[PDB]
Amino acid sequence: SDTMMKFNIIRNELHNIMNTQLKRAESEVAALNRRIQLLEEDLERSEERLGSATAKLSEASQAADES
Amino acid sequence: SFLENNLDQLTKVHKQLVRDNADLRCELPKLEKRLRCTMERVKALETALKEAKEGAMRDRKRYQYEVDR
Amino acid sequence: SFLENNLDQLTKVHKQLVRDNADLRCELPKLEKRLRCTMERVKALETALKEAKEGAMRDRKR
Numbered sequence: 001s002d003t004m005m006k007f008n009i010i011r012n013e014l015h016n017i018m019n020t021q022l023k024r025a026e027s028e029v030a031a032l033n034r035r036i037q038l039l040e041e042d043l044e045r046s047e048e049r050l051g052s053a054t055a056k057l058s059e060a061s062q063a064a065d066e067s
Numbered sequence: 068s069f070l071e072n073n074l075d076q077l078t079k080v081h082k083q084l085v086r087d088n089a090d091l092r093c094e095l096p097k098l099e100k101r102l103r104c105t106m107e108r109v110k111a112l113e114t115a116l117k118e119a120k121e122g123a124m125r126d127r128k129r130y131q132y133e134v135d136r
Numbered sequence: 137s138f139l140e141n142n143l144d145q146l147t148k149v150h151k152q153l154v155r156d157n158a159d160l161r162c163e164l165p166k167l168e169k170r171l172r173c174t175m176e177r178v179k180a181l182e183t184a185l186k187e188a189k190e191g192a193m194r195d196r197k198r
């Protein structure tokens with residue numbers, strides 16, 4: 001086929017890759033990274049509560065025997 | 068009892084974290100697959116460029132032959 | 137004692153989420169590197185395309 005037609009075909013499809021999948025991929029990895037860290041922070045706030053509830057239940061288990 | 072309301076609230080937080088974790092465990096492999104499908108399209112584009120490059124100088128030796136005559 | 141089954145389940149799910157997060161935090165940089173290497177290959181293809189397109193239009197100028 002024609003040579004200059006071949007270059008513009010490649011340019012157009014390459015434009016579609018950058019403007020759609022590659023563009024979306026950049027902002028998704030940014031969101032995914034931030035969401036993973038926020039989840040871990042939530043887990044780290046969660047452990048302190050679970051650690052305190054674990055101590056509170058054991059104290060109640062020992063206090064249920066003395067009553 | 069306060070402790071049972073506490074555990075019921077903690078249960079609720081974990082239900083949200085389970086759904087947040089399930090979403091992330093679904094998007095990360097999907098994004099790798101989408102990135103892999105992009106690189107296949109780029110590889111096809113790279114071979115299509117080399118086919119166009121050879122076609123361009125097949126035309127450059129043609130223009131030099133339309134001039135030498 | 138219901139309170140203990142609830143807390144024991146919360147303990148079990150929380151450990152599972154912590155280990156899942158460690159997997160997510162390790163697989164994610166591999167995804168960043170793959171995204172970075174894909175766009176590097178696209179840009180290299182793109183500048184090679186202009187060199188070929190304008191180089192083809194320099195030769196039609198003869």
